[PDB]
RNA sequence: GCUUGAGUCUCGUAGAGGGGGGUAGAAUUCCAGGUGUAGCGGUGAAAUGCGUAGAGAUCUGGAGGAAUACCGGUGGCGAAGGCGGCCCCCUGGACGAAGACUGACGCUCAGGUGCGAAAGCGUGGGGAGCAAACAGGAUUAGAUACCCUGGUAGUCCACGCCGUAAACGAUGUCGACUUGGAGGUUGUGCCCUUGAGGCGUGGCUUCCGGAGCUAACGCGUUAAGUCGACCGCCUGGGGAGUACGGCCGCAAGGUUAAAACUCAAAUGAAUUGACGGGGGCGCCUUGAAACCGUAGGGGAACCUGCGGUUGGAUCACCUCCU
């Protein structure tokens, strides 16, 4: 875990689209905090940060659109 | 939820000095400004129960004050709500 | 007061009036009496799904300290300014100065 | 790009997207209730295997 | 399904029935030989229809019953009442038992004959029949009961411990006797508006019947019937819906 | 008088807490074309249904109403009911930090007042999808069910009402005390060799379990332990939360609430056989829904819709003294 814990003890994060791409899928899901080893106080900060990313078009939605 | 400048001259009128804070006339005075404030917010927001829940919480909290120093100076009692305009 | 980012994008066929919109908006910062500690454009930007049918349109912020209301002004000018074709305000912490990652990937 | 390479490829891209299982569980409403009891019941028949 | 079982209560059907001559007679469901024997041997001769055509053959073939009837072998929704009651030279009483998914159908047919059919005499489940009888204003009361009290006068003749049954059911039930009106103490433009405007208003039995008939007529129109349209459906007797029903179609 | 309870202030923190207003990408349906053509659709199979006026399919363009895939968790917030796309605007509470300040200002609470799921009602909108009722096709000994094709109310919104739910942790509120242990979550201090770490230290919360308690089941420092203050409630089973009266409600109904009469029980937990249908391998042993509130249908007990709860099942024959 402590890897993972100083992902989150660095950083709080949106617009770093290239640190966005460690935490989705290919089809534009969200990751599983479990998978992403992060703990859930980083994963809502990265969802709420997802969220705003697919509204401006940085991230898409689907794998589609 | 009260800006610290409405706090600092409401404490600065009713408070002892800089140093007294919660003094039962500190008290009930930013509580009757934060009620008077809130009539604007309710005024709109009607169905806004559970923010009335801390408005009912803080006219009864105010009630309680004011019996206690009634009880223990009705000189400070009555020039306070006199200054307040409180049993309006 | 409250500081804020502003996000917005325009549309790639109207990206060169954009210096006359940072101007329209600065101005409504200035003229509000606020501060502004960041401005930025990221060019024509390619989308990850087509906005209003377009593509590769151009990406703007600012990061600013001003009073609500002009706040609201420069948001319902969006919706009168048909080249902005989206924006988001945002009520951040604090004002922040250091370029976004768009910029410092240059 | 054998024409079974690339439907293996796509097996497998279809089952780590899900799809199917997602559309088969949402072809009918259901009264919250259950699936709140039908989780903790899971929840508890996981929990049992952790004790040794 | 059920069909009778205890000769007391069997006994009291068939004598609260009073069948004899001078009656144009007709059972429907014979069902089992202890509770159509007494009937068919008060009445020097009588008519019958069976659903089923293996207990029509067990009956016909009895002795006592098939010289003493004559008996039919069919749904009596097919059955043609109406040249019965020439037949037999006067309106039918109608009467027995029966598995009464069938019931609700029973009285439409049965209706269908109001002329034919000089009374109906059956066992019926309490609920159903309790709605059957049931006053204008009780949560008893709804659009087939008001169907059946504006065809009929409804009279319960005696109700039945669900012990007496071959196969006993949980459910009590009664026997009920029904009369068409002589002449119709509402007389009717038609029944499909009857039907039509019961079905509407008791489909929205819960609220104003300004939100129910109203849907339809004006508050004015209901008012200028003498009718308040702020009342439920459960509020209105047969007679102000027959008024209603001359009033669509007198007024279309 | 006092500062320990209570409470104010300053600085932070986390959060589907509430109210108001914008807005997005999926999605369904629908409309308008376009390409296109004999089927589609549905089931166990059928039928009803839809299509040669071109359906279905698939492309584009538009409409409209509703809901927020994923994060999302044995997770947070909320008095409870409940709260989940995103942004803004207003707004409630909580917790930690470190002081400062008031000076017992406290707790509980009959009446009282207000909040209060789902259903239903009231007034005026909206109506995509879904769907009581209803309608029609099927199934069945019958089928009212279970199946299907339809479908109104309703579901949505503003503003009134109702005031109930297995509204249940089936566990009143407040305060003190009393072994441990493994987690979760959210502050915080100190040490960090940093970054991980490692010592602490609040709050919230989950599961084990000691003592003790408990009819037993179990509860167990978030007690069902040890106790202090006040409130609510029960006094065999049915009759019956039923009558009647009062109150309340637009109406539904709600609420308060009998008695006669009737029975020797009624009941909780737990033990052993049946279980049994088995299931595995003579032997170990289980592929074997109930309800709550509410609204409507009504051959049944029943059937249907909405949403909540889990309390998800059996049944029981031949004698005896130290
Ligand atoms: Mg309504
Ligand atoms: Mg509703
Ligand atoms: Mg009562
Ligand atoms: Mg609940």
């Given at each position: 875990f402590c890897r993972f814990t100083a992902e989150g003890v660095q950083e709080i994060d949106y617009k770093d689209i290239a640190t966005l791409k460690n935490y989705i899928t290919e089809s534009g899901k969200i990751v599983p905090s479990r998978i992403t080893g992060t703990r859930a106080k980083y994963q809502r900060q990265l969802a709420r940060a997802i969220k705003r990313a697919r509204y401006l078009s940085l991230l898409p939605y689907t794998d589609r659109h | 939820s009260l800006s610290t400048e409405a706090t600092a001259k409401i404490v600065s009128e009713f408070g002892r000095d800089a140093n007294d804070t919660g003094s039962?006339?500190?008290?009930?005075?930013?509580?009757?400004?934060?009620?008077?404030?809130?009539?604007?917010?309710?005024?709109?927001?009607?169905?806004?129960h559970h923010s009335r829940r801390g408005l009912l919480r803080?006219?009864?909290?105010?009630?309680?004050?004011?019996?206690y120093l009634k009880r223990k100076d009705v000189?400070?009692?009555?020039?306070?709500?006199?200054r307040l305009g409180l049993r309006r | 007061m409250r500081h804020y980012?502003?996000?917005?994008?325009?549309?790639?066929?109207?990206?060169?009036?954009?210096?006359?919109?940072?101007?329209?908006y600065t101005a409504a910062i200035t003229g509000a009496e606020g501060k502004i500690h960041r401005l930025e454009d990221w060019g024509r930007r390619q989308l990850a799904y087509p906005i209003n049918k377009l593509h590769?349109?151009?990406?703007?912020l600012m990061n600013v300290e001003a009073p609500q209301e002009v706040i609201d002004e420069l948001e319902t000018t969006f919706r009168f300014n048909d080249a902005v074709i989206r924006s988001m305000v945002m009520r951040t912490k604090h004002a922040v100065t250091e370029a976004s990652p768009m910029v410092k990937a240059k | 790009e054998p024409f079974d390479v690339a439907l293996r490829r796509f097996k497998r891209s279809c089952e780590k997207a899900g799809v199917l299982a997602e559309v088969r569980r949402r072809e009918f409403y259901e009264?919250?209730?259950?699936?709140?009891?039908?989780?903790?019941?899971?929840?508890?028949?996981?929990?049992?295997?952790?004790?040794? | 399904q059920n069909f009778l079982n205890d000769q007391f209560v069997i006994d009291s059907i068939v004598s609260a029935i009073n069948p004899q001559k001078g009656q144009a007679m007709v059972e429907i469901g014979p069902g089992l030989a202890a509770l159509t024997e007494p009937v068919g041997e008060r009445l020097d001769q009588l008519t019958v229809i069976e659903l089923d055509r293996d207990l029509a053959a067990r009956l016909q073939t009895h002795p006592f019953l098939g010289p003493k009837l004559t008996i039919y072998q069919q749904d009596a929704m097919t059955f043609n009442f109406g040249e019965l009651a020439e037949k037999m030279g006067q309106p039918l009483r109608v009467f027995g038992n029966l598995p009464y998914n069938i019931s609700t159908p029973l009285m439409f047919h049965l209706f269908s004959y109001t002329d034919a059919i000089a009374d109906m005499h059956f066992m019926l489940q309490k609920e159903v029949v309790n709605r059957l009888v049931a006053g204008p204003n009780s949560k008893a009361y709804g659009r087939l009961s008001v169907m059946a009290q504006y065809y009929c006068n409804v009279i319960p003749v005696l109700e039945v411990?669900?012990?007496?049954?071959?196969?006993?059911?949980?459910?009590?039930?009664?026997?009920?006797?029904?009369?068409?009106?002589?002449?119709?103490?509402?007389?009717?433009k038609d029944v499909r508006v009857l039907s039509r405007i019961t079905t509407e208003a008791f489909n929205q039995r819960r609220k104003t019947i300004r939100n129910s008939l109203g849907n339809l007529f004006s508050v004015e129109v209901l008012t200028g019937m003498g009718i308040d349209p702020a009342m439920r459906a459960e509020n209105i007797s047969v007679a102000q819906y027959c008024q209603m029903a001359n009033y669509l179609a007198e007024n279309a």
């Amino acid at each position: 875990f402590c890897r993972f814990t100083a992902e989150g003890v660095q950083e709080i994060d949106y617009k770093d689209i290239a640190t966005l791409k460690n935490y989705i899928t290919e089809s534009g899901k969200i990751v599983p905090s479990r998978i992403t080893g992060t703990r859930a106080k980083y994963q809502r900060q990265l969802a709420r940060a997802i969220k705003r990313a697919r509204y401006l078009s940085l991230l898409p939605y689907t794998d589609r659109h | 939820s009260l800006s610290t400048e409405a706090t600092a001259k409401i404490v600065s009128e009713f408070g002892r000095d800089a140093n007294d804070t919660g003094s039962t006339e500190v008290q009930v005075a930013l509580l009757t400004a934060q009620i008077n404030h809130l009539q604007g917010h309710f005024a709109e927001h009607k169905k806004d129960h559970h923010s009335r829940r801390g408005l009912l919480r803080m006219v009864s909290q105010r009630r309680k004050l004011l019996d206690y120093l009634k009880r223990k100076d009705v000189a400070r009692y009555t020039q306070l709500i006199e200054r307040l305009g409180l049993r309006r | 007061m409250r500081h804020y980012e502003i996000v917005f994008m325009v549309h790639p066929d109207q990206s060169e009036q954009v210096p006359g919109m940072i101007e329209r908006y600065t101005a409504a910062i200035t003229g509000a009496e606020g501060k502004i500690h960041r401005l930025e454009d990221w060019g024509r930007r390619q989308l990850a799904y087509p906005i209003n049918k377009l593509h590769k349109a151009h990406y703007v912020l600012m990061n600013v300290e001003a009073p609500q209301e002009v706040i609201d002004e420069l948001e319902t000018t969006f919706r009168f300014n048909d080249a902005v074709i989206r924006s988001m305000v945002m009520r951040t912490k604090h004002a922040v100065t250091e370029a976004s990652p768009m910029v410092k990937a240059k | 790009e054998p024409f079974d390479v690339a439907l293996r490829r796509f097996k497998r891209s279809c089952e780590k997207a899900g799809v199917l299982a997602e559309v088969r569980r949402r072809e009918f409403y259901e009264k919250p209730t259950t699936e709140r009891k039908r989780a903790k019941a899971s929840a508890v028949k996981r929990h049992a295997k952790k004790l040794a | 399904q059920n069909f009778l079982n205890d000769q007391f209560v069997i006994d009291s059907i068939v004598s609260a029935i009073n069948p004899q001559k001078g009656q144009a007679m007709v059972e429907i469901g014979p069902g089992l030989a202890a509770l159509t024997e007494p009937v068919g041997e008060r009445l020097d001769q009588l008519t019958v229809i069976e659903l089923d055509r293996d207990l029509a053959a067990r009956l016909q073939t009895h002795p006592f019953l098939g010289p003493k009837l004559t008996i039919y072998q069919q749904d009596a929704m097919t059955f043609n009442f109406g040249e019965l009651a020439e037949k037999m030279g006067q309106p039918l009483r109608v009467f027995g038992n029966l598995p009464y998914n069938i019931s609700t159908p029973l009285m439409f047919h049965l209706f269908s004959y109001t002329d034919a059919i000089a009374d109906m005499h059956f066992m019926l489940q309490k609920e159903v029949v309790n709605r059957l009888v049931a006053g204008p204003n009780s949560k008893a009361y709804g659009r087939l009961s008001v169907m059946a009290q504006y065809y009929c006068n409804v009279i319960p003749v005696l109700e039945v411990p669900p012990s007496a049954f071959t196969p006993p059911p949980k459910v009590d039930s009664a026997v009920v006797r029904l009369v068409p009106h002589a002449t119709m103490p509402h007389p009717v433009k038609d029944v499909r508006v009857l039907s039509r405007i019961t079905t509407e208003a008791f489909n929205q039995r819960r609220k104003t019947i300004r939100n129910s008939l109203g849907n339809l007529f004006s508050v004015e129109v209901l008012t200028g019937m003498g009718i308040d349209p702020a009342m439920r459906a459960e509020n209105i007797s047969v007679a102000q819906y027959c008024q209603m029903a001359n009033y669509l179609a007198e007024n279309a």
